[PDB]
From a paper:
KtrA binds nucleotides, ATP or ADP. ATP binding induces the adoption of a square-conformation by the octameric ring and increased K+ flux activity through KtrAB; ADP binding results in a non-square conformation and decreased flux.
A simple indicator of ring conformation is the pair of distances (L1 and L2) separating the Cα of N38 residues located in opposite subunits across a ring face. However, the ADP-bound ring conformations are different from each other and from the wild-type, with L1/L2 distances for the wild-type of 40.7/30.7 Å and for R16K of 52.0/21.9 Å. In the ADP-bound R16A mutant there are eight KtrA dimers present in the asymmetric unit, corresponding to two different rings with L1/L2 distances of 34/30 Å and 37/28 Å.
Numbering used by the authors:
A (entry chain E), B (entry chain F), C (entry chain A), D (entry chain B), E (entry chain G), F (entry chain H), ...: 6 to 222
Amino acid sequence: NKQFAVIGLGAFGGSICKELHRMGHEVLAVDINEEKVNAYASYATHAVIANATEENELLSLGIRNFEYVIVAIGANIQASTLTTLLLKELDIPNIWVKAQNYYHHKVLEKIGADRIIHPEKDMGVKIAQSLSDENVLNYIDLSDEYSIVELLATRKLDSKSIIDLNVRAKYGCTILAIKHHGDICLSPAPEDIIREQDCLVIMGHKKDIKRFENEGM
Amino acid sequence: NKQFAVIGLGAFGGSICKELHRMGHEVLAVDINEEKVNAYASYATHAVIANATEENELLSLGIRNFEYVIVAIGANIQASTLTTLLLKELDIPNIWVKAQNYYHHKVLEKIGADRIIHPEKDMGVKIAQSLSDENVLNYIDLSDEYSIVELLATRKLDSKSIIDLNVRAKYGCTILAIKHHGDICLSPAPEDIIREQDCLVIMGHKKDIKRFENEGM
Amino acid sequence: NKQFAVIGLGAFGGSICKELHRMGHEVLAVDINEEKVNAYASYATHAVIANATEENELLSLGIRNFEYVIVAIGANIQASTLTTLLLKELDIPNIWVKAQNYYHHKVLEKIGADRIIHPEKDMGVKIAQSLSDENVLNYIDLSDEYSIVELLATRKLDSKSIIDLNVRAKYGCTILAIKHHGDICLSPAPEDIIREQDCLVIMGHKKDIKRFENEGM
Amino acid sequence: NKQFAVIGLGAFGGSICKELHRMGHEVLAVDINEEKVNAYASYATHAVIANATEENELLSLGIRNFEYVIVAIGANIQASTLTTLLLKELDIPNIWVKAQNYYHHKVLEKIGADRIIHPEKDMGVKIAQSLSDENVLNYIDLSDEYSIVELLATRKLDSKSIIDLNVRAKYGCTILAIKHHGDICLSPAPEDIIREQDCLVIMGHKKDIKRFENEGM
Amino acid sequence: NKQFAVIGLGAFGGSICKELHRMGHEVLAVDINEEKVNAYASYATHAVIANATEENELLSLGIRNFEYVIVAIGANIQASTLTTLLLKELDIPNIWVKAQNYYHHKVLEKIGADRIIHPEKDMGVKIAQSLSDENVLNYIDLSDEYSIVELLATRKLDSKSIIDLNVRAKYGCTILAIKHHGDICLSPAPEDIIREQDCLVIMGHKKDIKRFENEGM
Amino acid sequence: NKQFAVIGLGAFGGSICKELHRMGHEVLAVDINEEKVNAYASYATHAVIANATEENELLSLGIRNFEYVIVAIGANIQASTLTTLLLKELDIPNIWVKAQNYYHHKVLEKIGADRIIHPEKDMGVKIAQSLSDENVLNYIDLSDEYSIVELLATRKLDSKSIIDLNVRAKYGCTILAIKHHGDICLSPAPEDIIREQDCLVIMGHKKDIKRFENEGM
Amino acid sequence: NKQFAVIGLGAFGGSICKELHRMGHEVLAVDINEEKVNAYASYATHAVIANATEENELLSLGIRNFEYVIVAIGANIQASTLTTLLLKELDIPNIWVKAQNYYHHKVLEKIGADRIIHPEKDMGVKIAQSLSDENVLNYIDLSDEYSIVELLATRKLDSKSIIDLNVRAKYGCTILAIKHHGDICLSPAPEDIIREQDCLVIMGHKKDIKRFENEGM
Amino acid sequence: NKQFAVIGLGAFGGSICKELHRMGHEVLAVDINEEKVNAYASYATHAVIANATEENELLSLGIRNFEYVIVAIGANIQASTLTTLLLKELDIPNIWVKAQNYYHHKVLEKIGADRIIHPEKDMGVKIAQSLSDENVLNYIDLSDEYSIVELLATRKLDSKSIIDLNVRAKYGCTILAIKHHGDICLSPAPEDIIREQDCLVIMGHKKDIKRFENEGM
Ligand SMILES: Nc1ncnc2c1ncn2[C@@H]1O[C@H](COP(=O)(O)OP(=O)(O)O)[C@@H](O)[C@H]1O
Ligand SMILES: Nc1ncnc2c1ncn2[C@@H]1O[C@H](COP(=O)(O)OP(=O)(O)O)[C@@H](O)[C@H]1O
Ligand SMILES: Nc1ncnc2c1ncn2[C@@H]1O[C@H](COP(=O)(O)OP(=O)(O)O)[C@@H](O)[C@H]1O
Ligand SMILES: Nc1ncnc2c1ncn2[C@@H]1O[C@H](COP(=O)(O)OP(=O)(O)O)[C@@H](O)[C@H]1O
Ligand SMILES: Nc1ncnc2c1ncn2[C@@H]1O[C@H](COP(=O)(O)OP(=O)(O)O)[C@@H](O)[C@H]1O
Ligand SMILES: Nc1ncnc2c1ncn2[C@@H]1O[C@H](COP(=O)(O)OP(=O)(O)O)[C@@H](O)[C@H]1O
Ligand SMILES: Nc1ncnc2c1ncn2[C@@H]1O[C@H](COP(=O)(O)OP(=O)(O)O)[C@@H](O)[C@H]1O
Ligand SMILES: Nc1ncnc2c1ncn2[C@@H]1O[C@H](COP(=O)(O)OP(=O)(O)O)[C@@H](O)[C@H]1O
């Protein structure tokens, strides 16, 4: 199929490897810590102990063959950078690297990392958003101004109909889904009822959704 | 306004604190490492050096007053657990804790954490999804089976109309938005055109979306 | 049989282990400090060097088999707590833990310690009672108001009879025992004599006993 | 009234100071740790930050005036010893010192401590006694053979009368008190009932009390 | 004249700054360690305490104005790299950086350092050359095979003439200079004499010079 | 051949060892840091982990046999000094030591170091000279005033003859060599041509060479 | 012969052990630092690694057998004291202990040390005496008034005879020895000569010797 | 009078300063530890806090004026060495330095210390001498082989005459003095009696004196 190499079996890298393996892709789990290799042996096609900063070991892995290599080392800046550089000189098509801080991001950028990810920082922003607003369970930003939001229904919304809560005209937003006791309603008709503590999926402008949260719920 | 306490200024905690501070909330950044306290001094209301496992220090912080306390320590399990337990005993309303593994999740659960977050595991699943399918930019899971997906349009989709790509009947999914050159089209009509390299927002069953990805694009 | 495990060979734990061993019970003395293990090797059935916060070591001890486990670590709160949690998850019937302060007591309480002991605090109250009243050698409180007290006889009590010192009617208290030159008299008859420097065991109300001490001796 | 000096506000010293202050005695709480002084300022007449090993500070406290000085430092042997020596040379009438081990006890003995206390060791013996016999809540030893014991009543004792349980004749021991739901009965008459889970106060020979526990409850 | 910025007043950087200042150039000596700034205050035009990794401080220095900026930080890789990057984004014409190891050299190379110097490594090669051959005081390599060498004259060369030591025909090398007691003779005539302990400057092939060293001196 | 001992595998020492090994000399690489020993194992005859300040280890190395011992420790003054002294008492013929500062130089001098080297300071002077004058590729100073300089030819020198550029009479300097495309011309005749970007080797007075650089190129 | 135990191989203890071993006595060198044990292995009968504060180790050494035990630990007061006490309870005949300060001296005294030595303080007094008076090289006091003094001969004494310097009649003192260029003359005859810079050994009254120093030399 | 500088108020240095001050000499007590300066303030002319390794502080002390400077730092080799070097370059007439080990002695020697003292080692030799022989009270070594010894007389010597104990012919040694009940006899005649427990002063060869101790007493 496609070939993925995950170097550094941290929580993030480990998750990548485990999930990718669940999808049934060829995943090479590389790790200098023996116990990590032993841990993810069940969760990979091939799990190898290797020092990814050592070039001959990287050649012994045959890493050139892989379409995607992911450097999930985000504590040891030197190791991460060095590995990324090695892979770049080894002409890897796609090099995705976990970064720790803005400047490690910078050096990764300059040595030509293809995609740089800050999992903790991002997820942190998300959890902070959920923290300031207990009503937002999840969301996705379509753009700087437009977004789809998942909301936890309050008492103000109990036994209310979609036609009763006219979001399409009053707030310019559109409701997409209602999740009640695990049961799910996609693109629901105006007659449908929303009961409290249910999942509500609205779509529109950020400020408009905020407005609806304010006066509506 | 609201009062937030962020204990452990890692990348995740640090991000929470920084972002929350950008929102203009009262954020107490707590950290046993002095340099971390000095680092996020600009991005908090009050930045304090404290051993969160040492309780008298926790009383010296006056943490009982806070509505939300975030334990963003995810490497030192013992520290995290001890701190969370301490906060629970101090009758803190909302305790959100970062977990490292399933078992740390378990002990947090049993000592009554209010919300447990796995930033790296989740983000890992997301990036893995993006890895197996270069065409998925982002997504949100409504449930175990149902999801809203953001797609990168290929050449197979160029100059194709929404009525041409009948997703609502052929695949049971519904298109929600089209992003073309930064311009944005919300809940578009069947006459609208999709050009390649544009953002496409589909909604439906996971397997169905996969189907459409397979035969459609 | 019943097997007792004493983790932490301090003065308190060490005393427990030594005394229990003198009683002829099967006692496992656990200690991360080698010299402590070597110290109490003579006073236990099995003395083992182990890190009780490390789960695999706790399994290597086979601690699950034990009816009673005593955590006598009272300086290192973190260690104590982690250990107690470990034992609880390992379904130990009776977990008795030494505590340092009110809140360490609390955290032990929430993670389900079966009995929490404050040796220094208690003993402190007792010695303080002995300090404010030079006459009291020892005592036991039956309740908030009622108590049995051991008293050191002064010259005021020399050659005095029980009927002479009518405590049962004049002070509402009752004399229980007289210890003279090591010889012992239990529940003595009214004809019996009390000589100075002897042990006197009175029983009654605290304030009443104080009265008898005041006007009597 | 009387003047007490408590040096070292640990759990033991702290307890002494707090309790003595509750009795309304003049207690000087001395401590090199500022936070401890701040902690027990409410529970002493004068709470001072001082290094008790430094002689000029000890004169600055005016410790010569005190009838009783208590050295409650039991971890730092050198500090305890040095302090005790200082107090001895300053002709203090009564010097009571907390000890850690047998040899610290020895050096305290040799430099002329007036009373040496091992709170943890003693309390440890007591709790161990309570461990080998679940029925004993508390006790006091009148001598090597004779003792007064507090017992937790089992189902075997429920709804039983004092005359029914003839301890004075069958076992040579005498019942002193019965505590039922917090209510208290001192030196109860033979008609009185003992209900389960109540506190029972027996007095007699150790082996005899053991006998009564064996066949009786 | 020209404007030089020396960041990091180590031995190497300090030497650069001092020497440059002796030549009468405008040299800005920058250093986060105050005592270093105080040390080279006499040997610079402007000596400033600054964190060169902090951008606003770098603007406060007005570093954009300088033609040459020298990063003489070679122990703290992160600091060096970071500074170099900052300078690069600020469009500095010439950035010369001291490197520690091959990989620090690599990252400097990739973030676009203009000249990278390894003082210890080079000087090391030179001193090693002097070690294997006690006769060489100094030298310069014209190419892989051809070189000009400074030699310490031995007794075999004492009172010997240039025509006596026919290097131009016997060894294919040419003598360039003779230094006697500080006095100096450039391109000396064949009648000229060489005395021991004098500086002799020969020019030719490496192996040929070695030959002359072998049989000649 | 000859035997060299390199103690302290820094950049300087490491360079010495590597270069000497390239020359094919017997080099003992000594280092207290295991990873350094492992690093230069390929670049030495024998690479040993040793604390050079410990005498018995120094005898275990058999360092007395070596003609040359190099102390390349330049951060840890005490280590360097102690080691050098050790070697001196062991009657080592030649002890060359890396120095950090003027006073470390002094103590090395007083304990009888045979040659003391300051690589960073020297090389620093050189780089400073190259900094104030961008034109010089390399050089060697014969004395305070007289020098041989290697110059990079500009367009002003293209297609010019040696007789055309009369340096011997107009500037009192003499051209020694011309390097064109790797090809090399030693002591060239006046008919020879200099093409731009070639290496030019001039010899004479510093100020005179400066003059020639100014008006000539 | 006799058996000596030297605990603590410092400079003082080490000197004791080495010297005693040179005399050919059975010396047990005990030390918790392995390297010290390895150091004095050549200079003892048996050199053992042991923690002298640990009683079971002290029994493992078989220290009860020894006539003399020397505690040469003078930095670690607690170790010294604890050890000394240990030896005392083990009924050691002679316990000689090195002391640090007056109070450590006190506690050693009180726990029954047989001889307490202050090497640095004493030797300090001596060197101070030599400092205030350059003429005295060494001396021994026979009593408060009478003494034997070693003097450095000055120029006033050069080429002078014993009969010339009539000390027995003019100064009431008697010359005992003359040391010239290492050669030694015991109880020299009146014809004997004193040369400058030689060692002169006078005997008599202190004030008389001072007198001779004044008027004679 | 004369001016002494004592740098480093240890036990040895402190002793020097105190004793010298008792003699009434001008003593400058220098110490980087403030508490030491405060301790010996009563026992010096001027007691100053100074870092003796810092040259400007040494000039601030005005140390050039002093005839004698004593470096009594014997734990911190670097401090001692650096200071000694500083004093030497400042041309102090007499520099006496305390040494720790043979190599520190060496570096002191090489940087030109005037007198080097090993108090612990020496005093150690003395105490060892007293240990192997309980009879020797004091002594002075004239040379490696020759010595004057003070001896405690045993019962073997009681009521014995000098002519009876013919040491001058039988052992080649000479008796110099007899101290009886505080009374003193200098250079006693052969008729004089020696009684036990008296001080006996013999002079001669070491082995010979040992011989006399063996067969005589
Ligand atoms: N030089 C290297 N070569 C190969 N793997 C490395 C190297 N350095 C680090 N790693 C890998 O990184 C992993 C540790 O990552 P971790 O420290 O857990 O990240 P985080 O601290 O962000 O959780 C280890 O399993 C190790 O295999
Ligand atoms: N017991 C504790 N008390 C207070 N702060 C702590 C404690 N343990 C860890 N921390 C803080 O947590 C931070 C480390 O978080 P980090 O390990 O970076 O999270 P992650 O591994 O998810 O990136 C440190 O800055 C440290 O100060
Ligand atoms: N993580 C741990 N695992 C095992 N034992 C521990 C741990 N932490 C502490 N201990 C035990 O506690 C013992 C000492 O307790 P101590 O500090 O003396 O209590 P206190 O200070 O109250 O006297 C040590 O000997 C050690 O074995
Ligand atoms: N030199 C000293 N002078 C005054 N107080 C001291 C000194 N040394 C220790 N202490 C006191 O001892 C107390 C700590 O005792 P602690 O270590 O808790 O005993 P334990 O560990 O046996 O419970 C501190 O409050 C401190 O003030
Ligand atoms: N970010 C920075 N900004 C300014 N100066 C710095 C920075 N980082 C390091 N320095 C300076 O560099 C110097 C250290 O250089 P050094 O480590 O001695 O080089 P080397 O190890 O090559 O001798 C310090 O004096 C410090 O002031
Ligand atoms: N006691 C010692 N014995 C032997 N080698 C030592 C000792 N102390 C330091 N070294 C050597 O010094 C080297 C480190 O020098 P380094 O700190 O890199 O100097 P700098 O910091 O000036 O570059 C190490 O390779 C180590 O082997
Ligand atoms: N309890 C102990 N048992 C055995 N050896 C000890 C003990 N305590 C200290 N020592 C030894 O004493 C030596 C240290 O003496 P040191 O501190 O150098 O004396 P000083 O400070 O007077 O020079 C060490 O080698 C150590 O091994
Ligand atoms: N560089 C220095 N300048 C001034 N005083 C110093 C310096 N280094 C050490 N000292 C002083 O020397 C004293 C330590 O002597 P110490 O180590 O007790 O000698 P010893 O080890 O022989 O007992 C300390 O009081 C300290 O203040």
